[PDB]
Design a protein around this ligand. Structure first.
Ligand code: BCB
Ligand code: BCB
Ligand code: BCB
Ligand SMILES: C/C=C1/c2cc3[nH]c4c(c3C)C(=O)[C@H](C(=O)OC)c4c3nc(cc4[nH]c(cc(n2)[C@@H]1C)c(C(C)=O)c4C)[C@@H](C)[C@@H]3CCC(=O)OC/C=C(\C)CCC[C@H](C)CCC[C@H](C)CCCC(C)C
Ligand SMILES: C/C=C1/c2cc3[nH]c4c(c3C)C(=O)[C@H](C(=O)OC)c4c3nc(cc4[nH]c(cc(n2)[C@@H]1C)c(C(C)=O)c4C)[C@@H](C)[C@@H]3CCC(=O)OC/C=C(\C)CCC[C@H](C)CCC[C@H](C)CCCC(C)C
Ligand SMILES: CC(C)=CCC/C(C)=C/CC/C(C)=C\CC/C(C)=C/CC/C(C)=C/CC/C(C)=C/CC/C(C)=C/CC/C(C)=C/CC/C(C)=C/CC1=C(C)C(=O)c2ccccc2C1=O
Ligand code: HEC
Ligand code: HEC
Ligand SMILES: CC(C)=CCC/C(C)=C/C=C/C(C)=C/C=C/C(C)=C/C=C\C=C(C)\C=C\C=C(/C)CC/C=C(\C)CCCC(C)C
Ligand SMILES: CCCCCCCCCCCC[N+](C)(C)[O-]
Ligand SMILES: CCCCCCCCCCCC[N+](C)(C)[O-]
Ligand SMILES: CCCCCCCCCCCC[N+](C)(C)[O-]
Ligand SMILES: CCCCCCCCCCCC[N+](C)(C)[O-]
Ligand SMILES: CCCCCCCCCCCC[N+](C)(C)[O-]
Ligand SMILES: CCCCCCCCCCCC[N+](C)(C)[O-]
Ligand SMILES: CCCCCCCCCCCC[N+](C)(C)[O-]
Ligand SMILES: CCCCCCCCCCCC[N+](C)(C)[O-]
Lengths: 323, 273, 334, 258
């Protein structure tokens, strides 16, 4: 076997490299240090990190959201530290339970939730500027930032755009470990079974597709590490036997193949489309479709099955039934 | 027609079984013994699906459903129209998958590359087996397996989740989902990074391995490196199923209650109850 | 931490839909052994002599019984409700006609409720029916009751920890979670849905597209209603020791016909039965029970699904005493 | 009335279903699948044709060429014409067009099959500041081996036949990634050094084990033009030779494994 593909048998150490960017060189902090054990499976060097105004702002806004959520969770256990720790996963900061439409809810029924959502958004925005700016500063394209923009957009869809489109803050995602999970079921139930939403399906096909493609691509490059396949940029600019063999592996297996550059386009696209597809689904839900299962029945697509135990009429529809 | 660099690689050898008998290409596709067995299983399986579908109520592709037997048949053969088609198609699927994987090994060998791809492909085959063979064996009936239908498979997933009240609280599911998400995200990051270096814009110069590492050191304070992000990507993707498999196997054979109640191990410790 | 195999599994839907009960044999066996403590029916007595409406002084519900039959009912009530305390839990030993002890008047109302359940709610209890034992299981206070706020332990025969107590505010989320099968759902489905008939359980639209006039802004139910229905459903499931597929094909929770089992229609009647019991029989006992029995808002303890079912899909695995004790119902008209 | 309902029994989500498939197939077929053809195309014909009259299809499947501006000067444009010249020491095993080829000589020296290398540039890969990227520790004096790992300098290289093939003299490090890529060894009974990629090396405390080739095959490893630097083409040549051994080190390796 190529043991190098499992771990680095002999580690190298040398002087730290710094690449100058257009601005910000004096805003890096930390003194790099090395981990021997990390160096078995990754680069041994940890740090330094760029600071900068946008990352500072991301932390300020993020910390404020975290404090708002945190202090509300604490209120939920009446400020008992031991019960906080115990009950943590079950604790949450919730959107309005009552229907006030798009009216700013009172603090005791959604208002803190809305405030947390605002600071979280400001935090993501600020981080996005960091992700985009660092690329420009180092003379790189902004591919990562466009992919990150789509993930942010999706969070905005389930957090506030869909709420705004149906006209109710009560529909937003709660903050909390189990509470954000419980939202998934309430949402799927209210909108008629998210398995019947095509965009849920497309998002999944892309997410599973990312699984498939990162397994395949990661395994492919490991299988050609012996010919320097991992040196991808110079394989793009000067095709070597590594990527000739990679392409032929696939061509011979599935009948077609990518190039070392374009396989990264496919990965970037699949990843993007997890979030694009989910967002379209969310924007259509409640706005233009109320029950996805019924929408699939209407359009001829839902499977149907025989009764196993007897078919059961709705008792509310029987003669003489109570309400 | 061959890729311009292809001919020099199109040599005899590298087979597992069969030697020179099936060591040829048909168009772009390598054949080999396992190409012949893949095709056989595909032909049988697909034909079986056509004939089963024609005995049901619909030709709509979304609505077609070929289902396993009733629980009461346990692990035995079922009549064709009461689960037997499904049994037959399952054996074909497994043989097609395994044939596909072993053919990938031959192609690897001929090219002198590692066997990492077919090894990685064993993970989804293993998960298929968890869902359709190992869990049904542990519960005692083929009828616990999932049906073959574009949408009907989702109806099975759905009811199975709800059989444990809220499947989201399954610890093995939480791991699987975390790996699913982090992997999608990491594929985006990796893809975007390589493209950002190769395509700076505006007739600017292509950048370097050093700019790649600088970018992430700057953004998150660590860069894993060019070879290692591929190892990582294979690890993350693989663990979607390697951890999920425990969540699936646990549900029924090792836990019969709702999943949320599983967390009473934490919540109900006398110290803080 | 985990439950060792084998599992018992049933089928409740078309093959290949993963529908059915999933059960642990040792749990089933322990519930069967608990439930098998239902005392056997007392020996049948001959019907003879005048109705007790003629013989005794203050008999208002069971006046048609003969003496032997009536005393047999009293013996059974004592076995079922106050076997540790005996006849004098309800009676003054020196005047059996005296109503001076509060359990006497409550017992009389309970007799009426029981007779109402077995006569008017056969769509739920069929010919299995209920007795006093179904809820009480041998103690004056039934083990599984609900107040207007969540309480722990669910079985009021277990001693509470400090945090379990309803006065310890820090424990609230756990009181809620253990009533909704350990979920984090931030709703108490008992007060919302079972105490009375003010709220609709249904939350899913019955059209593909959204109807203009009920789908925007303040027209809409808040998403909280969907979480609250899910909470109820988690609670019901746990109260019967079952899962969602006992009643539903999750393909469409909202659909009846082939997408629902006969048990779902039985459940629907059960909700109506419980609301009736609670509004018309149990809630109004707060004017008769001692302060010490009331919750913190002055309410009488009330019934939910668990009160009878106690973790089994049929209370007591379907054991019945209906023909042994016909004075508990069904009562013929006229 | 219903939100989303349109004329002619249509609804908005239904239209979006069609639009989404159109977007997906457009990006996949018209964009991605053409990016996939920046290398290797147009395809090469077993018999005649090509130049005589290229098919319309050969133009339709190609993207417009892009030009990379390189970090240290020059440019590269893809796709572009890259016919391969070197006579291939391969013969047809059978007449039909998908039959495999077979070596007419020593395939490791002839560089065919899994012993094949690509026609990469005869340029030394560079660091970001323009120095040689992959260099031996005798030149990369500011690099070292991590404490805790094996220093293979001095160790015997034991080949697939179990015979000692030579002695490790140095390691070649990638100064851009801080990563060892080759070991350099003195070849026993020849008067030369040879490089070996670390991916072909099982590094033990007391030996380097190499199963890809036999001991006597180290004499024909491709030679570098210069002692202390390596071109991209040389790297491809050196790696390919060991890879060839996996199929060709003995007559048995090409034949069915099981
Ligand atoms: C435990 C949970 C499971 C699950 C949960 C699941 C969900 C929740 C959803 C899917 C969806 C999908 N699943 Mg399923 N599924 C599928 C196939 C599929 C597709 C119909 C679709 C998109 C998948 C995709 O792009 O993947 C990534 C792979 C890619 C992108 C490569 C291309 C694959 C190609 C689209 C596969 C096409 C399959 C054929 C229609 C099936 C017939 C093959 C024969 C007859 C030729 C197969 C073939 C299997 C097998 C063999 O086990 C499987 C098992 C499972 N699914 C489990 C049972 N699946 C989604 C959907 O839209 O369903 C309608 C969806 O929402
Ligand atoms: C019973 C309910 C169910 C449900 C409910 C559900 C809902 C309601 C929604 C999904 C959605 C989706 N579902 Mg589904 N689902 C999925 C898969 C998926 C995803 C592909 C997609 C979610 C998008 C995502 O990637 O989120 C993970 C990625 C996220 C959340 C992006 C975050 C990025 C962000 C920039 C990160 C920021 C982090 C900051 C550091 C944090 C700052 C902290 C603050 C406090 C300062 C599978 C594979 C299955 C199976 C196997 O059954 C399934 C079943 C179910 N889903 C059930 C049917 N699903 C979504 C969808 O597609 O709808 C159409 C969706 O909205
Ligand atoms: C209401 C019920 C729910 C549910 C029920 C559910 C169950 C019952 C199970 C999962 C499982 C899983 N769920 Mg969950 N789930 C997931 C995510 C996921 C996955 C990460 C994970 C594994 C999927 C799998 O087994 O694929 C399997 C895919 C296979 C086997 C593919 C085989 C491919 C084959 C080898 C090749 C096929 C080739 C084609 C036939 C070829 C076609 C030819 C063409 C292309 C030429 C998310 C992200 C969510 C969200 C967002 O809520 C969600 C919600 C839910 N899940 C609900 C709560 N989920 C599984 C798990 O791991 O649980 C721990 C699982 O068992
Ligand atoms: C399909 C594609 C996907 C995708 C894509 C991409 N995803 C990206 C990018 C791309 C392309 C990036 O470029 C960006 C990045 O940089 O990558 C390195 C990023 C990100 N993906 C994150 C997480 C994530 N992605 C998820 C999902 C997907 N992503 C999907 C799957 C999921 C889930 C739920 O699945 C999660 C959790 C973060 C790591 C990161 C954002 C950090 C942020 O926005 O931070 C902003 C927030 C902070 C800085 C908070 C700081 C709080 C401090 C530490 C705590 C203070 C404590 C104390 C209270 C203070 C007291 C104060 C005192 C003085 C009084
Ligand atoms: C964790 C890592 C993972 C991972 C990894 C990898 N994945 C790989 C490889 C690696 C490494 C490859 O090398 C191999 C390949 O070559 O890639 C291009 C492959 C492949 N991944 C496939 C599909 C795929 N991967 C999924 C998941 C993951 N992949 C996860 C995420 C999923 C889902 C649902 O998630 C799907 C659908 C094909 C595209 C391909 C197999 C072709 C095949 O086997 O051909 C042989 C078989 C056929 C062509 C048809 C067989 C027809 C049978 C007889 C009859 C049908 C029966 C069937 C049961 C009916 C189902 C109906 C349905 C509605 C329920
Ligand atoms: C009843 C009946 C008639 C039945 C049918 C019978 C039948 C099948 C007959 C056909 C007989 C024929 C024609 C031939 C016999 C020989 C034979 C074995 C044929 C096989 C035919 C067959 C079964 C084909 C199907 C192939 C197949 C499973 C294709 C799926 C392709 C899919 C969906 C892939 C998903 C992943 C994906 C999005 C990939 C796109 C991106 C690519 C191509 C990545 C690959 C790739 C990666 C990952 C790199 O890292 C890389 C790095 C550097 C350079 C290149 C690459 C590279 O190409
Ligand atoms: C469940 C639906 C019940 C059935 C059937 C019967 N009873 Fe009941 N009982 C039930 C509740 C919810 C309550 C209120 C809680 C309480 O303990 O007060 C009661 C109460 C009584 C009492 C008073 C107990 C006490 O407070 O000390 C008595 C005496 C009583 N019930 C008697 C009784 C008899 C005789 C029944 C069969 C005819 C009977 N109950 C049925 C719940 C249920
Ligand atoms: C039978 C004992 C049931 C079990 C177990 C579960 N549910 Fe149920 N469900 C049941 C009934 C009788 C009703 C209707 C009540 C009424 O008064 O109309 C319901 C309703 C739902 C709904 C609402 C459907 C709608 O039309 O809006 C949902 C979403 C629902 N049930 C889901 C659900 C889940 C997730 C369960 C397991 C956790 C579950 N139910 C159990 C009967 C029974
Ligand atoms: C314009 C107007 C009127 C209002 C603002 C509009 C706006 C932008 C609203 C945006 C709302 C959005 C995007 C809401 C989205 C919410 C989402 C997607 C939430 C999702 C998931 C959340 C999860 C899993 C959160 C878990 C959080 C925790 C576990 C936090 C724990 C915090 C602590 C332990 C801190 C302890 C600190 C101690 C001192 C108390
Ligand atoms: C982000 C898009 C905003 C579109 C506005 C759609 C209006 C929905 C109805 C809002 C009614 C709520 N209100 C005003 C009563 O509070
Ligand atoms: C998002 C802004 C915060 C809400 C704005 C309204 C002010 C709070 C008034 C609500 C009533 C106060 N309280 C605590 C009872 O909720
Ligand atoms: C959500 C966005 C909120 C704006 C606050 C963030 C401020 C960061 C701006 C710094 C920009 C510096 N720059 C131009 C060099 O990138
Ligand atoms: C659908 C696959 C597309 C992969 C390429 C993504 C391109 C969009 C990002 C362009 C921004 C890059 N740049 C060089 C201008 O900064
Ligand atoms: C994940 C859910 C996917 C369900 C897709 C439902 C498609 C509806 C659009 C028309 C389908 C056409 N038809 C009649 C062939 O069924
Ligand atoms: C529902 C998820 C959508 C994923 C799309 C799948 C893309 C695979 C396309 C391969 C096309 C191959 N080819 C040679 C015909 O172009
Ligand atoms: C792949 C493992 C298969 C496990 C099957 C073990 C039990 C088989 C029982 C045979 C039943 C006989 N019959 C005729 C009903 O099929
Ligand atoms: C994962 C390997 C499977 C091991 C099989 C364990 C045996 C238990 C099977 C239950 C008995 C089968 N039966 C008779 C119910 O059909």
């Amino acid at each position: 076997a190529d043991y190098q593909t499992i771990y680095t048998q002999i580690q190298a150490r040398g002087p730290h490299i710094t690449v100058s960017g257009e601005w910000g060189d004096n805003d890096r902090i930390g003194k790099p240090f090395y981990s021997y054990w990390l160096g078995k499976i990754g680069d041994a060097q940890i740090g330094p990190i760029y600071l900068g105004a946008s990352g500072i702002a991301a932390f300020a806004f993020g910390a404020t959201a975290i404090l708002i959520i945190g202090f509300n969770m604490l209120a939920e256990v009446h400020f008992d530290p031991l019960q906080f720790f115990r009950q943590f996963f079950w604790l949450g900061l919730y959107p309005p339970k009552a229907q006030y439409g798009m009216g700013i809810p009172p603090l005791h029924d959604g208002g803190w939730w809305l405030m947390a959502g605002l600071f979280m958004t400001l935090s993501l925005g600020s981080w996005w500027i960091r992700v985009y700016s660092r690329a420009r500063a180092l003379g790189l394209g902004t591919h990562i930032a466009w992919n990150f923009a789509a993930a942010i957009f999706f969070v905005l869809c389930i957090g506030c755009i869909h709420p705004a489109l149906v006209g109710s803050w009560s529909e937003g995602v709660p903050f909390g470990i189990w509470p954000h999970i419980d939202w998934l079921t309430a949402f799927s139930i209210r909108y008629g079974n998210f398995y019947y939403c095509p965009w849920h399906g497309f998002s999944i096909g892309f997410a599973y597709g990312c699984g498939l493609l990162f397994a395949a691509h990661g395994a492919t490059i490991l299988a050609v590490a012996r010919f320097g396949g991992d040196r991808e940029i110079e394989q793009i600019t000067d095709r070597g036997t590594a990527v000739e063999r990679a392409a032929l592996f696939w061509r011979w297996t599935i009948g077609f193949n990518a190039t070392i550059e374009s396989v990264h386009r496919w990965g970037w696209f699949f990843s993007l489309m997890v979030m694009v597809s989910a967002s379209v689904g969310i924007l259509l839900t409640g706005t233009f479709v109320d029950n996805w299962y019924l929408w699939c029945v209407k359009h001829g697509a839902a499977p149907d099955y025989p009764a196993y135990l007897p078919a059961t009429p709705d008792p509310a529809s029987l003669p003489g039934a109570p309400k | 027609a061959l890729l311009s660099f292809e001919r020099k690689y199109r040599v005899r050898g590298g087979t597992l079984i069969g030697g020179d008998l099936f060591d040829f290409w048909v168009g772009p596709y390598f054949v080999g013994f396992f190409g012949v067995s893949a095709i056989f299983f595909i032909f049988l399986g697909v034909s079986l699906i056509g004939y089963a579908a024609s005995q049901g109520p619909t030709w709509d592709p979304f609505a077609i459903s070929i289902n396993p037997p009733d629980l009461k048949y346990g692990l035995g053969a079922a009549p064709l129209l009461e689960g037997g088609f499904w049994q037959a198609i399952t054996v074909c699927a497994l043989g097609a998958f395994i044939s596909w994987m072993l053919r990938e090994v031959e192609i690897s060998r001929k090219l002198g590359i590692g066997w990492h791809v077919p090894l990685a492909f064993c993970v989804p085959i293993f998960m298929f087996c968890v869902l359709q063979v190992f869990r049904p064996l542990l519960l005692g009936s083929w009828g616990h397996a999932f049906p073959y239908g574009i949408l009907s498979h989702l109806d099975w997933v759905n009811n199975f989740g709800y059989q444990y009240l809220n499947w989201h609280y399954n610890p093995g599911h939480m791991s699987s989902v975390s790996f699913l998400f982090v992997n999608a995200m990491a594929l985006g990051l990796h893809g975007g990074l390589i493209l950002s270096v190769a395509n700076p814009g505006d007739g600017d110069k292509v950048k370097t391995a050093e700019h790649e590492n600088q970018y992430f050191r700057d953004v998150v304070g660590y860069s894993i490196g060019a070879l290692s992000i591929h190892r990582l990507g294979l690890f993350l993707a693989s663990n979607i199923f390697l951890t999920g498999a425990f969540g699936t196997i646990a549900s029924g054979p090792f836990w019969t209650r709702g999943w949320p109640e599983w967390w009473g191990w934490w919540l109900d410790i006398p110290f803080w109850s | 931490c985990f439950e060792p195999p084998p599992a018992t599994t049933t089928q409740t839907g078309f093959r290949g839909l993963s529908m059915g009960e999933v059960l642990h044999p040792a749990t089933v066996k322990a519930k069967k052994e608990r439930d098998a403590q239902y005392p056997p029916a007392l020996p049948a007595v001959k019907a003879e002599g005048p109705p007790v409406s003629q013989v005794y002084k203050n008999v208002k519900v069971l006046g048609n019984l003969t003496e032997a039959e009536f005393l047999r009912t009293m013996t059974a009530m004592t076995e079922w409700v106050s076997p540790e305390e005996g006849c004098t839990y309800c009676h003054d030993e020196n005047n059996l006609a005296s109503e001076a002890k509060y359990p006497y008047v409550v017992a009389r109302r309970m007799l009426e409720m029981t007779r109402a359940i077995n006569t008017n709610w056969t769509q739920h209890v069929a010919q299995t029916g209920v007795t006093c034992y179904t809820c009480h299981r041998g103690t004056p206070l039934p083990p599984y009751v609900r107040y207007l706020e969540p309480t722990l332990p669910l079985n009021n025969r277990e001693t509470p920890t400090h945090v379990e107590r309803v006065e310890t505010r820090s424990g609230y989320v756990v009181r809620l979670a253990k009533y909704t099968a350990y979920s984090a759902l931030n709703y108490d489905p008992f007060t919302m849905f079972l105490a009375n008939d003010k709220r609709q359980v249904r939350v899913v639209p019955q059209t593909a597209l959204p109807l203009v006039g009920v789908s925007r802004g303040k027209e809409r139910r808040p998403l909280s209603d969907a979480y609250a229905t899910f909470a109820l459903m988690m609670s019901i499931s746990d109260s019967l020791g079952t899962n969602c597929t006992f009643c539903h094909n999750a393909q469409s929770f909202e659909t009846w016909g082939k997408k629902s089992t006969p048990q779902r229609a039985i459940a629907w009647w059960g909700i109506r039965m419980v609301r009736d019991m609670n509004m018309n029989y149990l809630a109004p006992l707060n004017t008769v029970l001692p302060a010490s029995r009331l919750g913190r808002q002055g309410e009488a303890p009330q019934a939910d699904c668990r009160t009878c079912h106690q973790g089994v899909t049929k209370p007591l695995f379907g054991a019945s005493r209906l023909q042994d004790y016909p004075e508990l119902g069904p009562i013929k008209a006229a | 009335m219903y939100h989303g309902a349109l004329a002619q029994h249509l609804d908005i989500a239904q239209l979006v279903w069609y639009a989404q498939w159109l977007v997906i197939w457009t990006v996949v077929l018209l964009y991605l699948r053409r990016e996939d053809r920046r290398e290797g195309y147009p395809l090469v014909e077993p018999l005649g044709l090509v130049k005589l009259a290229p098919e319309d299809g050969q133009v339709y499947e190609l993207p417009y060429p892009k030009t990379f501006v390189l970090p240290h000067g020059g440019t590269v444009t893809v796709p572009r014409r890259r016919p391969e010249t070197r006579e291939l020491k391969l013969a047809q095993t059978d007449g039909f067009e998908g039959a495999p080829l077979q070596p007419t000589g020593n395939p490791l020296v002839d560089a065919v099959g899994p012993a094949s290398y690509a026609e990469r540039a005869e340029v030394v890969d560079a660091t970001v500041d323009g120095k040689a990227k992959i260099v031996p520790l005798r030149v990369a004096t500011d690099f070292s081996i991590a404490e805790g790992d094996v220093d293979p300098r001095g160790l015997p290289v034991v080949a697939a036949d179990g015979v000692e093939a030579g002695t490790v003299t140095d390691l070649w490090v990638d100064r851009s990634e801080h990563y060892f890529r080759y070991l350099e060894l003195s070849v026993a009974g020849s008067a030369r050094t040879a490089l070996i990629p670390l991916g072909f090396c099982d590094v033990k405390k007391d030996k380097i084990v190499v199963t890809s080739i036999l001991s006597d095959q180290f004499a024909n490893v491709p030679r570098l033009q210069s002692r202390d630097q390596i071109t991209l083409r040389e790297e491809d040549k050196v790696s390919a030779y060991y890879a060839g051994g996996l199929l060709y080190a003995t007559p048995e390796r090409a034949e069915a494994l099981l």
